[PDB]
C-alpha cells in the first residue's frame, strides 16, 4: 500500500519541528539521497558523499557539485557564461 499521504521520508521525524520545516527538508532529503546519472559512464550511479561530493558507483569519478543535488542552477549558468566568454577569446 501507499504507506502515508504526504510526510514521505520525513516520517522519521514524526510530529516534531513544525510541518513547514519538515516539508523544507523533505525536498532536500530527496535531492540528496537521489541517484544521479553519470556524466562519464552514462549510468545512474552517482550518489552524494559528504555535502558537495558526488561520486559514481562503478566508474568512480567523483564530481564536486551541489550540497544536496549534483549541479546547482547557479553553477550550470556559470558554466554557460564562461563558455560564452571562452568561445570569444577562442575567436
Amino acid at each position: 500500500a501507499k504507506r502515508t499521504k504526504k510526510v514521505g521520508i520525513t516520517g522519521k521525524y514524526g510530529v516534531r519541528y513544525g510541518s513547514s520545516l519538515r516539508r523544507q527538508v523533505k525536498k532536500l532529503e530527496i535531492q540528496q539521497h537521489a541517484r544521479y546519472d553519470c556524466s562519464f559512464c552514462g549510468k545512474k550511479t552517482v550518489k552524494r558523499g559528504a555535502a558537495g561530493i558526488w561520486t559514481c558507483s562503478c566508474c568512480k569519478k567523483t564530481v564536486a557539485g551541489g550540497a544536496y543535488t549534483v549541479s546547482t542552477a547557479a553553477a550550470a549558468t556559470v558554466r554557460s557564461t564562461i563558455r560564452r566568454l571562452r568561445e570569444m577569446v577562442e575567436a
Binding site: 523544507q24 532536500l28 558537495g52 564536486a64 550540497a67 546547482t72 553553477a75 557564461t81 564562461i82
Partner: protein
C-alpha cells in the same frame, strides 16, 4: 571537517626538482577526480583553472581569488560563493571585482583566481531541524555554541544582565568607540528594525 565546501587534492610536478608537490585547493562546482587543471597567465578559460585576473575577460566568474598577488587565495572561498570581474585598468594594472557581500573592489591584476564557483552551494538552505544537528556543526568548528542571551544573566555578567524583567535597559546600539565590556548588542549600527531592501 568544519568546512562547507569540499577540497580538491591537486598534484603538480615540481619544476625545479624531480618530485611531486600536491596542492590543497577548494573544489569549484564541476571539477572531477582525474580532471586536468591549468594554472597560470596563459592557461585557458575553463572551470577549474587558475588565471591572473587581468587575463580574464570582463564578466568572468571566479573564486579563491587573492587580495595581494601571491597570497594564495583570500576572497570567495565558502560554499557557493564567487566573485565577478567587472573591469580593468591596464595602466598600473588593476582589476575591479564585486565580492560575495556585494562590495566592489579593485585589486592588482596579477592577483590569481580560479575559474568557476565554489562547490557545495545551497548548504544553508536546509532547516537544521534539531539542536544536535547544530551541536555537531560547531563540534567540528569551535566552542561558540550554544548561546545564552545576556538578558538572562545577572548584571555582574553582562551589560544586559539583571532586572525584575528580562529587558536591555539602555539602547542596544553601541558606539563604535566603545570599549571591551561595553560592546554587546548592535555595534556601530546605522539603522535597525526590519529592512526594506
Amino acid at each position: 571537517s568544519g568546512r562547507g565546501a569540499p577540497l580538491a587534492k591537486v598534484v603538480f610536478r615540481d619544476p625545479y626538482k624531480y618530485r611531486l608537490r600536491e596542492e590543497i585547493f577548494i573544489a569549484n562546482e564541476g571539477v572531477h577526480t582525474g580532471q586536468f587543471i591549468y594554472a597560470g597567465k596563459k592557461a585557458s578559460l575553463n572551470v577549474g583553472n587558475v588565471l591572473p585576473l587581468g587575463s580574464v575577460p570582463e564578466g568572468t566568474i571566479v573564486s579563491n581569488v587573492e587580495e595581494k598577488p601571491g597570497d594564495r587565495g583570500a576572497l570567495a572561498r565558502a560554499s557557493g560563493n564567487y566573485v565577478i570581474i567587472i573591469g580593468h585598468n591596464p595602466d598600473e594594472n588593476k582589476t575591479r571585482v564585486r565580492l560575495p557581500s556585494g562590495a566592489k573592489k579593485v585589486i592588482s591584476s596579477d592577483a590569481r583566481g580560479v575559474i568557476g564557483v565554489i562547490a557545495g552551494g545551497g548548504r544553508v538552505d536546509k532547516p537544521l531541524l534539531k539542536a544536535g544537528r547544530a551541536f555537531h556543526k560547531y563540534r567540528l568548528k569551535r566552542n561558540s555554541w550554544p548561546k545564552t542571551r545576556g538578558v538572562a544573566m545577572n548584571p555582574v555578567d553582562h551589560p544586559h544582565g539583571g532586572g525584575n524583567h528580562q529587558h536591555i535597559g539602555k539602547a542596544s546600539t553601541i558606539s563604535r568607540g566603545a570599549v571591551s565590556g561595553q560592546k554587546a548588542g548592535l555595534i556601530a549600527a546605522r539603522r535597525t528594525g526590519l529592512l526594506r531592501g
